[PDB]
Design a protein around this ligand. Structure first.
Ligand SMILES: COc1cc2cc(OC)c1OC/C=C/COCCOC(=O)[C@@H]1CCCCN1C(=O)[C@H]2C1CCCCC1
Length: 124
């Protein structure tokens, strides 16, 4: 395998967000912009120095798709997913925290990795 694998799901096609479907989902609907979305996730910096998971909070993570409550990669990435799907996302800094970073958690120009399971979504 290669590092830069997965489908480029960016609009600009700059391979900034690469997606692999690891578990196929059910039903033909993906969420609409503005839908409330319910997920479980495991995330990390590619340097392995930091890790975050919804399981640490012992409850699904909920956000409104496409409202910028999460990094760009998530708004783009979760919009592509079916209910029940598990996907991996490899994310360059331009679709995460950029050259400014987000200290102390996220250094400048960080690459991020997430596994996300789309549990459900509801039209608000
Ligand atoms: C567990 O707490 C955090 C988790 C992430 C980022 C954080 O601040 C940048 C962060 O600090 C508290 C702030 C939370 C508010 O949302 C920040 C935006 O977070 C995000 O957009 C993405 C996706 C949704 C789950 C959290 N996200 C994060 O990047 C995590 C990081 C934490 C470090 C490992 C890689 C993931």
């Amino acid at each position: 395998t290669v590092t830069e694998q997965g489908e480029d799901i960016t609009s600009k096609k700059d391979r900034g967000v690469l997606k692999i479907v690891k578990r196929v989902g059910n039903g033909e609907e993906t969420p609409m912009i503005g839908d409330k979305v319910y997920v479980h996730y495991k995330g990390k910096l590619s340097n392995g120095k930091k890790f975050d998971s919804s399981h640490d909070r012992n409850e699904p993570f909920v956000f409104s798709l496409g409202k910028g409550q999460v990094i760009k990669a998530w708004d783009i990435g979760v919009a592509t997913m079916k209910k029940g799907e598990i996907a991996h996302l490899l994310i360059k800094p331009e679709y995460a925290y950029g050259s400014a970073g987000s200290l102390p958690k996220i250094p400048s120009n960080a690459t991020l990795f997430f596994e996300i399971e789309l549990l459900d979504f509801k039209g608000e």
